[PDB]
Amino acid sequence: SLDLSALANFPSFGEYDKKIVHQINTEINKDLEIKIKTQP
Amino acid sequence: ASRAKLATNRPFEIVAGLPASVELPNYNSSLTHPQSIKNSGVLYDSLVSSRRTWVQGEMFELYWRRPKKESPTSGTIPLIRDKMQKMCDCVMSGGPHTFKVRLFILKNDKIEQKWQDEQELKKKEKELKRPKRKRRKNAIKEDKDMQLTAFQQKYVQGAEIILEYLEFTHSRYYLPKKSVVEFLEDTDEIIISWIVIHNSKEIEKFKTKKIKAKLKADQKLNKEDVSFNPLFEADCPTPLYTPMTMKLSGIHKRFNQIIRNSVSPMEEVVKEMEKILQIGTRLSGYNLWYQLDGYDDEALSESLRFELNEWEHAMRSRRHKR
User: Residues of the signal sequence (chain A)?
Assistant: First the structure.
């Protein structure tokens, strides 16, 4: 539900700012589980 | 150096073994799956490297190192202890890092002989011309704190100062004579500035070659019938140079005179620096990328992690040796 509000925030053929790209990376990061071999 | 040769076209370069770029990192544009700084540890690696380098770097000329072990070389330890005089404990800041130091004087024997001669001259001049008060103890304490005791009265000017790290007593370095010293009376802080040349060995060796050439020419002329400054010479290789500045805090009034007397005539080094600044190549300023991609940089990430592990594994033994 909150993503739908986030979706309405998305650029709509205007002059929107870079900050969207952070959300984009958030969605992109979901692609696959993180194969972190050795914990820091 | 043996660190994994980065795959072609990475948005970073490996500087001092770590991923960095001249421009400010744009993670958001460049990384799809950025590992956390926790995951990367690049920041950690940078900090440890920084501190260690500050403990071991080339900022001050090294002069004594504890010999790596009825060998009489043991007997030399008290001799090296006595050849310096013992002085009080003072704090130093290195970039974002801070360090603590005790002070040690390098005994200039010429100052001792001249002091004996001066006492002789003063004695001969004078001969030719011819409960207990605690407040007095406080006066003597303050006088010895801002005036000079005998060892300080002889070593006012031309005394030689050695630096040592209280967290790493194994190395001793010379305080830069070619340095600008400012004593802040209000804050009791001292700022030292100096220019440093990364290929200084190249310049010194070329300088030796030129000195040999001039000596050979003079010998050839003599067969028939000098403030050599490498930085002024037209054929001197390009100095890769950096300007440096550092602040000291915690030094007491009496020591400031000794320090203030110890450094070189200012105009001469200023002119030398100006020449260095025209001829020098300045070190480029760059930005570390602390976040790496878990997929494209997996090898680099794991390599860093491994090296960090080894560093930490060694670091415990350092205190275990105490």
Answer: none
The data reach a resolution, in angstroms, of 4.4
- Residue length of chain A: 40
Cα B37 from chain centroid (whole Å): 31
What's the CA gap between B62 and B56, in Å, rounded? 9
CA–CA gap between residue B143 and residue B252 (Å, rounded): 12
Round to the nearest angstrom and report the end-to-end CA distance of chain A. 35
Residues of B in contact with A18 (CB under 8 A): 28
Q: Spell out the residues 6+ positions from residue B187 whose beta carbon is closer than 8 angstroms to its own.
A: B249
> B283: helix, coil or strand?
coil
**For residue B142, is it left (φ>0), alpha (ψ between -120 and 50) or beta?**
alpha
- Residues of chain A positioned with their CB less than 8 A from the CB of B29: 21
Q: How close is the nearest chain B Cα to the Cα of A15, in Å?
A: 18
Whether residue B302 and residue A29 make contact (CB cut-off 8 A), yes or no, is no
Quote the CA–CA distance of B280 and B283 in Å, as a whole number: 9
Residues of A in contact with B39 (CB under 8 A): 36, 40
Which residues, at least 6 apart from B68, have a Cβ–Cβ distance to it below 8 Å? none
Residue B249 bridge partners (DSSP): B91, B189
Strands B189-197 vs B180-184: parallel, antiparallel or unpaired: antiparallel
